Amino acid sequence: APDTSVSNKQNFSTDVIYQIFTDRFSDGNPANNPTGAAFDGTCTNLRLYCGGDWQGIINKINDGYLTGMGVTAIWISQPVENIYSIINYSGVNNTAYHGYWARDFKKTNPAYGTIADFQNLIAAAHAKNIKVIIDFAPNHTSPASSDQPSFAENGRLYDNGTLLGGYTNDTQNLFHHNGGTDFSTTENGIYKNLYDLADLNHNNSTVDVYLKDAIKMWLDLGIDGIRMNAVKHMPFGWQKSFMAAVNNYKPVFTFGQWFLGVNEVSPENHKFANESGMSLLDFRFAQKVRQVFRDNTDNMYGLKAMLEGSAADYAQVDDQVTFIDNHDMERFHASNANRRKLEQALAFTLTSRGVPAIYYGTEQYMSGGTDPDNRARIPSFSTSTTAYQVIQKLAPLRKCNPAIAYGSTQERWINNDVLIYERKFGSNVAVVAVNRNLNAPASISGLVTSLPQGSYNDVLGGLLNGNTLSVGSGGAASNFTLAAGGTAVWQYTAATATPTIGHVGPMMAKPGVTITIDGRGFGSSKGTVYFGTTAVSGADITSWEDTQIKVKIPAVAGGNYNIKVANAAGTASNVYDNFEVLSGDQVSVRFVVNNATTALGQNVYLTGSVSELGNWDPAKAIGPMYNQVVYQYPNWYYDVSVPAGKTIEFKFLKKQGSTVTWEGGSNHTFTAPSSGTATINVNWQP
């Protein structure tokens, strides 16, 4: 199959995700509706169950609503079993309608449906070329009070019906008991509870194994991707081990939720996306989009800076999931606002780099404030809205024009209100023009592009007041008027002669695992695959076609390798960096160093004899380590993904910037567990 096939679970760049709040989409099976005080059929009480379910989604998939829009992927509420409690908050009744209050990761939420219902959903979707993504929140269970066990379900955790433990009397330490987070620091947000939710302790062996076993179940059920909840609130090392588990079994496209506020640019966030084994929801993109197109707090210059900065900050920018709003933000469309604002933002997102995600109902001009006002029941299934049509015309471009899916981004024309950008991949090109100024047209002269000579019709058909583009030799466009609030899309596709890599997935795994390499001009005959300088050919290359290659990772030493391919004739392609070859199966180990004093601004890091520990290279050391919550300074701790059953040598370091102070004496030594977790505790050697 080609790169665009529904079967491609490793790449979503050619797709368009539709974010569904299951309960608020469509109640296709009233028989499974919750009853009494936990339900409101009218969906007037936004905190109770409204009845939306999997059967409903199936119906919507079957009746053309999503397909007619060009949607090729869906992201649904967490499917696992949630508590049944009806909680009274501020005099208001609340339910688990959102799917975030888990009780059993190996069962389904009966309100959504049964396992059989789930299987059917998967089948229905696939039959319509729609990939299925599930929300997964292994960071906590549900609302609890250690002092008052009768409150809710006491964050109880079950294993396929078998009780493991609750928040009260947590002798095994399945959960964290450090109060609630205040988001003052990263460490703080990880080792403390979100709201009143029972925080899961991933260092607990039972929890580790269980969670890993659970995801396997869902993978076995046929999912195509995973949306990881609050990744900024779980230990990074643990998550890396989780991704390894997934990748070394059945790799699927995974992206996490790492919230960013307005004007917020985080290096920690970049690093996580670059080395965790998963990508992230593009908050930087989303926030900038709202500023420029919605709240008028920034202009095109800021939009361009975000695009350029992001492309450099993210090793795999094309893996970031873009959006303009979500279940945790106020709806993009303001009641009294000009609809063109939303239309423009949509078009921008659909034609930009990454993986676009659209929050259900956006296309219906839904308005609403923060939770739960942004989660009303979809008021219509009309295909006649302008927004619907915008998506309908642009979504498919992601499939047919690889420039949109894998291309670079380049500004071609700009002013306070206008932005004209170009996407390019091999012989493929796409040019988009946006004039956010709703009252003034712009006179466009001097525009230069990569489009061949000719005339180009607006892909939007003038829907957003766009126009035809005339390109002479040299890619120079003839003078034209860009209507007030105008938006136009011009594109070109053609055969690519030379092998071009547009995407690789997964990006982190152990030898023997099969990876997917997508792009154009690979040819039909098996060529050669390079991992760094190492060449792979023949048998290990499972399949080879023009747009996609399937190959087994070679048994090279653990480390980072750049990927390249060559056609059967020996022609090399571009290089796709940052591939991570693991040393083997991974386990999550907690490292604790005692009595490591430092000066303000100086932190402790971990280094060692394996790739996972940076192979003694301080620049690749793990950290900075933590010293407030679990353990207190001068004792430091950190959770790390290491190779199972291996004997590892390690040392600690103290660093100020890139300046490094090595721990004295001899190296510490330990043997990693074969499965489950472990905690290594030593004293800093002077």
Ligand SMILES: OC[C@H]1O[C@H](O[C@H]2[C@H](O)[C@@H](O)[C@@H](O[C@H]3[C@H](O)[C@@H](O)[C@@H](O[C@H]4[C@H](O)[C@@H](O)[C@@H](O[C@H]5[C@H](O)[C@@H](O)[C@@H](O[C@H]6[C@H](O)[C@@H](O)[C@@H](O[C@H]7[C@H](O)[C@@H](O)[C@@H](O[C@H]8[C@H](O)[C@@H](O)[C@@H](O[C@H]9[C@H](O)[C@@H](O)[C@@H](O)O[C@@H]9CO)O[C@@H]8CO)O[C@@H]7CO)O[C@@H]6CO)O[C@@H]5CO)O[C@@H]4CO)O[C@@H]3CO)O[C@@H]2CO)[C@H](O)[C@@H](O)[C@@H]1O
């Ligand atoms: O020994 C004494 C005592 O100790 C112990 O008690 C302590 C507790 O153990 C401890 O946890 C602590 O609890 C208290 C809280 O600390 C305190 O805040 C207060 O909590 C209140 C809330 O204030 C109040 O609002 C309400 O909360 C309701 C909500 O109103 C309601 O909306 C609903 O929310 C749920 C959502 O609907 C649902 O979707 C889901 O949300 C998801 C979200 O959808 C998902 O995408 C993801 O989002 C996160 C994101 O990951 C994260 O980054 C973050 O984003 C922030 C950014 O990072 C920041 O930069 C900045 O921008 O801000 C944003 C947003 O904050 O947040 C996103 C979510 O907003 O993740 C979400 C979670 O999966 O789930 C939502 C939560 O359920 O439902 C909640 C109810 O849960 O009510 C709570 C509780 O009353 O009060 C708590 C109780 O006091 O402190 C206790 C005392 O010290 C012992 O237990 C006790 O016995 C002992 O006596």
Ligand SMILES: OC[C@H]1O[C@H](O[C@H]2[C@H](O)[C@@H](O)[C@@H](O[C@H]3[C@H](O)[C@@H](O)[C@@H](O[C@H]4[C@H](O)[C@@H](O)[C@@H](O)O[C@@H]4CO)O[C@@H]3CO)O[C@@H]2CO)[C@H](O)[C@@H](O)[C@@H]1O
């Ligand atoms: O907002 C998050 C903060 O996180 C980071 O802070 C780090 C420091 O950079 C580390 O050096 C370390 O801090 C130690 C400190 O090294 C140690 O001396 C001691 O600090 C004393 C301090 O010497 C003294 O002058 C006085 O201020 O009292 C302090 C309390 O002991 O203990 C510190 C830890 O408590 O660890 C912190 C993280 O905990 C980041 O670099 C900061 O910018 C940021 O504030």
Ligand SMILES: OC[C@H]1O[C@H](O[C@H]2[C@H](O)[C@@H](O)[C@@H](O[C@H]3[C@H](O)[C@@H](O)[C@@H](O[C@H]4[C@H](O)[C@@H](O)[C@@H](O)O[C@@H]4CO)O[C@@H]3CO)O[C@@H]2CO)[C@H](O)[C@@H](O)[C@@H]1O
């Ligand atoms: O190149 C392959 C080599 O790899 C392995 O060597 C590792 C060591 O095992 C680590 O311990 C570490 O070495 C540190 C050392 O721990 C640290 O003390 C420091 O050494 C100073 C020393 O403190 C000082 O007294 C004086 O002796 O100078 C030394 C500096 O040279 O710095 C070392 C790092 O430079 O890292 C090395 C890899 O760099 C393996 O064990 C070796 O057998 C192998 O050759």
Ligand SMILES: OC[C@H]1O[C@H](O[C@H]2[C@H](O)[C@@H](O)[C@@H](O)O[C@@H]2CO)[C@H](O)[C@@H](O)[C@@H]1O
């Ligand atoms: O001609 C190449 C030139 O095109 C663009 O410059 C625009 C500029 O953005 C407008 O504000 C206005 O001044 O017209 C110029 C074209 O004459 C690119 O921005 C620029 O990099 C490029 O050199």
Ligand SMILES: [Ca+2]
């Ligand atoms: Ca139902």
Ligand SMILES: [Ca+2]
């Ligand atoms: Ca946590």
